[PDB]
């Protein structure tokens, strides 16, 4: 995702025998990450019926 | 801009066989300054149309 940084700078000495100069603007970047996970588990059977509960 | 400083001084020993002396007042000065400033900025164009906003 992008962004626009705000302006800054001096004013100037407003004066003759010379002219002004305009100025500019910049831009910028931003990132992120996707991640993903999972697991599992299991059992036997014979044990289940022999143990008295599930 | 000007100003008038306030009076000060001794009284006297009021007595015969002697006399008094009038006294005076002063004045004073003050200044200031004018200042002036400015600046400018600008952009391109095709960047504007190609970037998706202004």
Swiss-Prot record, chains A, B:
Places the protein is found: Virion
Superkingdom, natural source: Viruses
Parts forming coiled coils: none
Subunit architecture: Interacts with the scaffolding protein gp11. Interacts with the decoration protein gp12.
Entry function: Capsid protein self-assembles, with the help of the scaffolding protein gp11, to form an icosahedral capsid with a T=7 symmetry, about 61 nm in diameter. The capsid encapsulates the genomic DNA.
Similarity comment text for this entry: Belongs to the lambda phage major capsid protein family.
Protein name listed in UniProt: Major capsid protein
Source organism of this protein record: Bacillus phage SPP1
Portion held of the full protein: 56 to 109 of 324
